[PDB]
Amino acid sequence: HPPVVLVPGDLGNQLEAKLDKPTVVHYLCSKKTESYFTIWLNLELLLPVIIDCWIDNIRLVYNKTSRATQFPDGVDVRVPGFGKTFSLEFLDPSKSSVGSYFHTMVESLVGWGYTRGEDVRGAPYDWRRAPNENGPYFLALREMIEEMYQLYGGPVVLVAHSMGNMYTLYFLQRQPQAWKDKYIRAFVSLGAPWGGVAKTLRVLASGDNNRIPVIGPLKIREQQRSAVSTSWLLPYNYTWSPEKVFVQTPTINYTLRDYRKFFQDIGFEDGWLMRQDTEGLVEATMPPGVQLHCLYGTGVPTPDSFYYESFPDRDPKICFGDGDGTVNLKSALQCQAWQSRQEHQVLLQELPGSEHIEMLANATTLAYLKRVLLGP
Ligand SMILES: *[C@@H]1O[C@H](CO)[C@@H](O)[C@H](O)[C@H]1NC(C)=O
Ligand SMILES: *[C@@H]1O[C@H](CO)[C@@H](O)[C@H](O)[C@H]1NC(C)=O
Ligand SMILES: *[C@@H]1O[C@H](CO)[C@@H](O)[C@H](O)[C@H]1NC(C)=O
Ligand SMILES: *[C@@H]1O[C@H](CO)[C@@H](O)[C@H](O)[C@H]1NC(C)=O
């Protein structure tokens, strides 16, 4: 069986931080730590009394002069577990079921004869950033793939979830065809948001706590805005119509041609700069150039557009289309376009009734992966 590399999505791996801050936002915030501690996922940091401390540490600072993000003064954030699986199997190192992410899939792989840290490895990254600020990650990923090829005696299968698919596409678009022909066996794409997702507009406008309900929406919005990866995933014109209205208000409509206005009107102008930094990273039409299995959920109501009475609106009204709850069905038309642009096969697989996250622990998903890996 071929070696496997797992690429997670947003919020999809542990992060650690170390502090030596000159100032804090309130007295209950720690100024200094002697060592690194887990900053994602640790439920104790997200209680109402101290969530402001967490926000202050996990936010990125946007520097308009350098057009780059930086950590807050006296904060360092690192990604543990590169080359291992623990930090994507469980988001919370307490190993609570709330943070179980790649665990079910890795358990299956091990049952089929894989070994953690050897022929199955994780490629975690700082998911707050877009690929433009994760150059070293891509170098390390390339090296790890080459090593795994040599050690385990054949080309590697990449398995990516959610935003990890866009990271993987970026990577593959930038490797020479000869390199991919040698080192990559296949790319199994799970819940890929090709061309962005409509719900990103609501996230940026009013916050989205559905994944972490112990955080109030307006509080978590601060983190979500600060993450370049959020703006990177706004809808693109190669998937969506330039005339589609994603956000409607009584006085103004926002389409994908109106992001500058949108960011002004929600009070977050840096987001427009982030979008400009990132909108060109993934080449709109260029296929990955490897055997591709596109697995996408359908039959789950998926936010498509929003009505706001103004900004900021406690409850926006929501219009739903088809998809997996998060990724709109239209994203899967992007894999269809690639069929005629590359020689390697592109296989589409619908997963009816499969929700965006649940697809990772779903027996049908795992049966499909087994077929890809073991051939039977
Ligand atoms: C912004 O970046 C510039 C150039 O890279 C640097 O001189 C400056 O220190 C940065 N600003 C802040 C507030 O750190
Ligand atoms: C597609 O969007 C990009 C910016 O993301 C833009 O440069 C290009 O002109 C657009 N294509 C259209 C409107 O046909
Ligand atoms: C957006 O506003 C335009 C105004 O020219 C309107 O015709 C259109 O119906 C609005 N949105 C939608 C989703 O139809
Ligand atoms: C597993 O995914 C299939 C679609 O492939 C879906 O029919 C089913 O509802 C899912 N099972 C669970 C337990 O969510």
Curated annotation (Swiss-Prot):
Changing N362A: Loss of glycosylation site. Slightly reduces production of the mature, active enzyme. The keyword Signal applies. Disulfide bonds join C29-C53. Changing L47S: No effect on phospholipase activity. Strongly decreases transacylase activity and association with membranes. It is a peripheral membrane protein. Pfam families: LCAT (PF02450). Inhibited by zinc ions at neutral pH. Zinc ions in plasma may keep the enzyme from hydrolyzing inappropriate substrates. N-glycosylated. N-glycosylation is important for maturation of the enzyme and normal subcellular location. The keyword Iron-sulfur does not apply. Belongs to the AB hydrolase superfamily. Lipase family. Has dual calcium-independent phospholipase and O-acyltransferase activities with a potential role in glycerophospholipid homeostasis and remodeling of acyl groups of lipophilic alcohols present in acidic cellular compartments. Catalyzes hydrolysis of the ester bond of the fatty acyl group attached at sn-1 or sn-2 position of phospholipids (phospholipase A1 or A2 activity) and transfer it to the hydroxyl group at the first carbon of lipophilic alcohols (O-acyltransferase activity). This is Lysosomal phospholipase A and acyltransferase.
